[PDB]
């Protein structure tokens, strides 16, 4: 195990102290240098730029070398534990926590390095394309005629109901059944004080959202999932109450003024049955979608951006939030999105990306995906898919058959991070599109069916029939949907 590696490292350090430049036998030092080396290794494990000063050149070099060796051993043990994470070789009971902690500290170091690269270097968001996307969102809002958020006054009627619902949600999330902690008691006490004095609570929330433009130290904790770790972030209790309040206010205002369109809307409906059922019926209720007599074709593309989190332009987020919501709440949201990150011993940096665990974060991701939807689908395509603001359409319906038959993109759906397109196209457009694709990225050696994401649902008569035509249509559609959006904001 790693104990043998640690013992060998300690023995090597002792030999280096005895052999690697001992400066003669003159009543030399003791294991205090080993304690300094251990402290330096812990400091590196904190992702800190500190070191172990107060030692000579060769002693410091040997200390750094032994620390790098122990670090390589720990990283190798962590890689072996991560390779055995899905199955875990009949996953044990005690090693799970150690492997999860090692992976957590590794990701903390990685996020610190990413924040340092974003801060020192200038990995911007394509400022020309960013201004273009801002102008596009401006035109989209002007076409939709969606009014911005009137930041919560104190004399609103349904504000007490919203605050009570927020307190109920926060209490249902905090304590389920006989659960408490050192700070959870503070959260329950704050919820009780809010339920007692709702006017004082609303005044305090208004004072925080209108004046407080900062936040306290927010912690992180990784959920012990098998495949994909789900991190959960913890924040201050009063900050959490204000978070829930302005979040619920934003939700009510958006549902009242229809800020969110239906395509980007996992929303008020049974999520699995309604999505799959309306999807299949729209694929079935299309304008003769199953007709393939005239050489027509259909393409269905499913993807996940992997760019609906930290990979965000914070200044662009503040600009869009000021474009759609008043300046105070938008500034407070932009401030809370990059407040602080604290590990068990480390202190991760901020101003790198959105913290998804903070409350009132769902409004941002669905509005951040809304700009990406305006970019990928376009302006006229979205305007036809939705309908006019005076008389919009259903979740997958058009105003007339011409609105669907004009453009190629027929059906469009979006998850919290997933995206699903279904577009029909004629044979002339197919030939032109394959011509463009081969002109951009040809496949002369017939290496176009090598890497193709296929399923295992009866792969003899139901899998994708890998022919010369369809295989290339898929790749070229995917490339076309890697050209609309910029490769720096998000990719597929």
């Amino acid at each position: 195990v790693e104990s043998h590696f640690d013992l060998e490292l300690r023995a090597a350090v002792m030999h280096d102290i005895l052999d690697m430049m001992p400066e003669g036998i003159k009543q030399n030092k003791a294991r205090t240098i080993l304690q300094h080396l251990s402290e330096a290794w812990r400091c590196w494990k904190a992702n800190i730029p500190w070191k172990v000063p107060g030692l000579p050149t060769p002693i410091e070099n040997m200390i750094l070398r032994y620390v790098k060796a122990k670090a390589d051993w720990w990283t190798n043990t962590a890689h072996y534990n991560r390779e055995r994470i899905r199955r875990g070789a009949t996953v044990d009971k005690t090693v799970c926590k150690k492997n999860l902690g090692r992976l957590t500290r590794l990701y903390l170091k990685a996020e610190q390095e990413r924040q340092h690269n974003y801060l020192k270097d200038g990995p911007y968001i394509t400022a020309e394309e960013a201004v273009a996307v801002y102008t596009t969102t401006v035109h989209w809002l002007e076409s939709r005629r969606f009014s911005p958020i009137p930041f919560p006054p104190l004399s609103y009627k349904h504000d007490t109901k919203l605050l009570i619902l927020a307190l109920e949600r926060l209490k249902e999330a905090y304590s389920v059944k006989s659960r408490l902690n050192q700070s959870q008691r503070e959260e329950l006490g704050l919820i009780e004080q809010a339920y007692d004095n709702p006017h004082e609570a609303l005044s305090r929330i208004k004072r925080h959202l209108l004046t407080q433009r900062a936040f306290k130290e927010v912690g992180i904790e990784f959920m012990d999932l098998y495949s994909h770790l789900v991190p959960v972030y913890d924040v201050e209790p009063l900050e959490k109450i204000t978070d829930a309040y302005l979040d619920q206010y934003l939700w009510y205002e958006a549902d009242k003024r229809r800020l969110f369109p239906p395509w980007i809307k996992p929303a008020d409906t049974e999520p699995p049955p309604l999505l799959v059922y309306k999807w299949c019926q729209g694929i079935n209720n299309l304008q003769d979608v199953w007709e393939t007599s005239e050489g027509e074709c259909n393409v269905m593309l499913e993807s996940r951006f992997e760019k609906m989190y930290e990979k965000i332009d914070l200044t662009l987020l503040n600009r869009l939030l000021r474009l759609i919501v008043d300046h105070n709440i938008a500034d407070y949201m932009t401030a809370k999105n990059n407040v602080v990150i604290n590990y068990k011993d480390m202190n991760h940096t901020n101003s790198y990306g959105i913290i998804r665990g903070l409350q009132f974060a769902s409004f941002i991701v669905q509005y951040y995906g809304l700009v990406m939807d305006l970019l990928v689908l376009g302006l006229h395509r979205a305007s036809e898919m939705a309908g006019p603001p005076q008389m919009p359409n259903d979740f997958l319906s058009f105003q007339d058959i011409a609105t669907e038959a004009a453009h190629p993109i027929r059906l469009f759906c979006r998850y919290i991070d997933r995206i699903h397109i279904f577009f029909r196209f004629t044979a002339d457009e197919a030939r032109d599109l394959i011509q463009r694709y081969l002109t951009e990225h040809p496949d002369p050696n017939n290496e176009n069916i090598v890497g193709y994401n296929n399923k295992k649902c009866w792969p003899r008569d139901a899998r994708m029939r890998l022919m010369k035509h369809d295989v290339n249509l898929g790749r070229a559609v995917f490339w076309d949907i890697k050209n609309r959006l910029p490769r720096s904001v998000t990719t597929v």
Binding site: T75, H79, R82, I85, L106, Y107, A110, L229
Partner: peptide, 9 residues
Amino acid sequence: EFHKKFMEK
């Protein structure tokens, strides 16, 4: 090393 580990886990 770290990139593939952070991508596949």
